[PDB]
Symmetry: D2
Subunit: 324 residues, 4 copies
């Protein structure tokens, strides 16, 4: 059997409430990894599992300094001969951010599979148990190697690059509308469908193994009447990058243009993404900033932060956005 | 034939470039309403049409003060016996905002149909000509009365309350994933599917006739490492409301909580929405602010601006979010 | 509390296996309604429930003669003052067919809510317990009245007329891509979004309480090299109707045309639907047969079968396909 | 510039009508390939194009004998040093079938791109011109090689193996809900997203060069009261294979089981697929026949027909369904 580490970080998957129908005020923070494992003892027939408690927080509170440590720990685990893959339990709210950070920074072809749940562990028809079992199946299959970092919920295997939480509250929220899933897990069998045509993991230039902090990057929203003062505030607080969740295809109002021009004069890198949820922001030399290709705001922030650890060259950063 | 006013505001539907393949740097601002009409002379068999040029701007520059004037003008038109319906040509980037605003403020059951195009008028396979024909058909049909404000592109009829631009760049971008379309237009026939189960138009409390300005509302994004100082800046600049484009189901970090509590202390109403794109932000009394129900951030800002013209009572605002 | 009858018919929702991971060869037929109810005792806080075993079969084996009895039983139940609504447990494979039959023939505004599960009751993370809770919530809510027949799974409420099983094997399979959900159930709360703009239940002409047999209607697929001899076979076996699951918008090959013409010569009513999954088959006088509007093949067969109990006039049948 | 051959087969892309709004009774058969090319002279900046007229039919009339000749012609063209790629204009109704056939039988890594249109060439906002331009851009790009056969409409690049016509009548009908698109074309730029993880073209065992006919395979629908006599009829008429468009996950009624057992006794290979539109039909040793993995009925028919040119060994055929 393959040797799989289950690295727990918190989330609703490790949430507990006093009744099976409670959806608010459940606690995250007191349910440990061994309790998740013991709730699905069937995982032991798929892998020799070892639980490790990395953190126990609601993912809305996950921070880049912590994600950096998570990436470094995973890289340490995967460098060992006795570890074949890692499953990371996490909250759904920012799993796409953590997963994509690891997607770019893990220097191994061994599987890294993020898993989460929309319903607490105590809920009627809680999704975490099956999601965990699926995640371990994926992480322990030799065919899963070399595919980049994965996010597994609800019988689906999503690439960290494309998958996003699309719905506030449903079980089937993780989707990649235009890019689909890498694979699905049905009837205890994995069906691989796609390989992402982007750079990741062992073919990625990003390396944060020796680093202790990351560039500050903020996200500003685009909408009617959007204010210029938010750009001033960001600049004043020392951002190195701004991701713009733009109207449409990264379209910018007269106020946003003024703000972006100010940020650029101070050396801030501006990436124009979209608030829409999907699709390409195309290049446009008449507008300020670089373009996010098909990276959503949350993903674009992660790529920009990592880009800034190794370059300041806008041509290179723009190429990263087209290739990662 | 029905009498329809085509009230033009700008957008890529009135955009023009020197070649049929140009997708950036096309111009908006020089193509008038009568040129759109004359490009589809078939429209004169569907309705007696009259063009009126309201504005000629890219919709990323549309502002609340202008949308207020647009609502006021549409109400004046619809009050006339010689107007059966109004089609409004608009940019796609913020049509959902303008349309939702009219949805809540137009005091007539006569159809109001926003129309837009993703490709400029000069493009190969431009979508605007057919979109416009479909919009005029929808606006003139008796079956279209009392449906709320509508957004028509790509053979679909979306309710202003549910429809959103879901993709930066595709023809099929307007979708309501969980709510579907009010109807479709196929083979020159309208097929109505649904009537929205929400308050609007003639049953709405909101009335902005005689207002000249609207309460200031900003939108802040939720993400890992989101900063408290953006809430400070908003407060400092006199916002009356903040809509939060939250992680997941309106989930808030420790930093966002601190910012939100500060804002509330200053009398700012906070609405927690979601960055996800879809779904319900459920109530949770322990967290700060009110919840957006299924309203996305852009829609929630419109509803909140209008709510603030009438009340500061959180109970009443929250009920508006569940009913409009 | 409302009074709800849970009328059980079988399905995977009532399926059982000896382990939590078994997805094939689980048994349907030996898990009774009271076993479903006692697995979610929380239901008793939502309603006073009474279980009634109507049948215990896999739904691929459900037949129109049995559906007719189901409809008759539900009408008896809903005519009682001590019954506020009915939840029907059913297999997912043909729930859309049973549900739409009831949608057209139940002569009450009281809620009728079909529920099903994609995982057996014994499965890890089985969906049926929460689905059943949600269905009883919907059936017991006074706001659920007058909506037509509903199908509830995975936190969604679909209209029988629009919902379909879109995926062989996933929890989120039930969707209505173009028409959306009537509502959703999140955080123990119902959010109604739409009302269907079609005739049903108390405004439907179909009444089968005195119906003594059902007309025979077959469905034939359209594809390259489709054979004429299947139409011959259908005609020879006495079908009264054929639903064609056509290529595209009910497009017919030269062979299909020959078959359809033959069928019509013999008095068989032909409806051209689509194999695509969604959308409108528009009228086309140059082709044989009537058109299905937006009814998929399974739904079109149900409506045709009912229509044939009342009329053989193609103009009347065609108008039923545009209004129901 | 690359050398691209446009090989025309017919379809609505080559349809013509007397007015721009006519959606029925337009003619296919009178617009030649040069007329398509001359409608988009911009194409000549993308490629050196040569048109060849293979056929001029509505695709609902396309047959396996003709597709076999199309595949043979494409293989001849791609064997030339002076041909860099081929674009094939085709009707939308059965493009998925012709494309998948070629996906399995073209013995080159040079791009083969099918293109189609939902509106006739004469329509207001006809989609064919831009679709054709996009197809030529894709076929001419060196990065397009080795990707399998592609289907291009509406700014999307779909794999022949996953793409299907999902809606009877809309421009955005071609989708792969679970698998996404191989890429997209926005702003005159190609964005590749995925490589399919299936065998195709140069890695495929199939070579039909030299064959003039194919094994007979019919598709039978699954539904409530489905009849055994359609199985009898197919067997009687000499089918070598039956694809079942099953209820749910290839679920079979007692009548379908009887028919399938009869067919298998006569040496007919039965594949259980799904009518649902998407997803996996899993193995089940208790049911008759092989399973279609995620192949929909139309695609499963093509693979089975090809498989039958080489083998009747169910173990091999089943592996093919999992790998092609
Ligand atoms: N707030 C939780 C939500 C979840 O995990 O479903 C988290 O992200 O930690
Ligand atoms: N920026 C344009 C985009 C469009 O109309 O498609 C607008 O919103 O005015
Ligand atoms: N064959 C089962 C499938 C399910 O219920 O999910 C049924 O329809 O009865
Ligand atoms: N019947 C046409 C439809 C189209 O091309 O859109 C065809 O498949 O040839």
């Amino acid at each position: 059997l393959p040797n799989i580490v289950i690295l727990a970080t918190g989330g609703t998957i490790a949430g507990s409430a006093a009744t099976g129908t409670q959806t608010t005020g459940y606690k995250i923070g007191a349910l440990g990894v061994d309790t998740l494992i013991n709730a699905v003892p069937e995982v032991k027939k798929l892998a020799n599992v070892k639980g490790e408690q990395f953190s126990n927080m609601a993912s809305q509170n996950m921070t880049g300094d912590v994600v950096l440590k998570l990436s470094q720990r995973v890289n340490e685990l995967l460098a060992r001969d006795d570890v074949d893959g890692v499953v990371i339990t996490h909250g759904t709210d920012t799993v796409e951010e953590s997963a994509y950070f690891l997607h770019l920074t893990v220097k191994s072809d061994k599987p890294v599979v993020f898993v989460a749940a929309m319903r607490p562990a105590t809920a009627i028809s809680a999704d975490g148990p099956m999601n965990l079992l699926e995640a371990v199946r994926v992480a322990g299959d030799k065919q899963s190697r070399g595919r980049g970092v994965m996010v597994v919920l609800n019988d689906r295997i999503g690439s960290a690059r494309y998958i996003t939480k699309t719905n506030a509250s449903t079980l089937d929220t993780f989707k990649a509308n235009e890019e689909g899933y890498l694979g699905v897990i049905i009837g205890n069998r994995i069906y691989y469908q796609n390989r992402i045509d982007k750079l990741h993991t062992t073919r990625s230039v990003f390396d944060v193994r020796g680093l202790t902090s990351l560039p500050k990057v903020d996200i500003l929203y685009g909408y009617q009447d959007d204010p210029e003062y938010l750009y001033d505030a960001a600049i004043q607080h020392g951002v190195k990058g701004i991701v713009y969740a733009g109207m449409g295809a990264g379209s910018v109002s007269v106020r946003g243009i003024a703000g972006m021009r100010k940020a650029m004069e101070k050396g801030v890198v501006v990436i124009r993404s979209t608030r829409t949820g999907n699709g390409i922001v195309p290049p446009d030399e008449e507008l300020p900033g670089l373009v996010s290709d098909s990276l959503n705001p949350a993903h674009a922030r992660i790529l920009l932060m990592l880009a800034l650890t190794r370059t300041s060259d806008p041509k290179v950063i723009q190429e990263y956005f087209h290739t990662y």
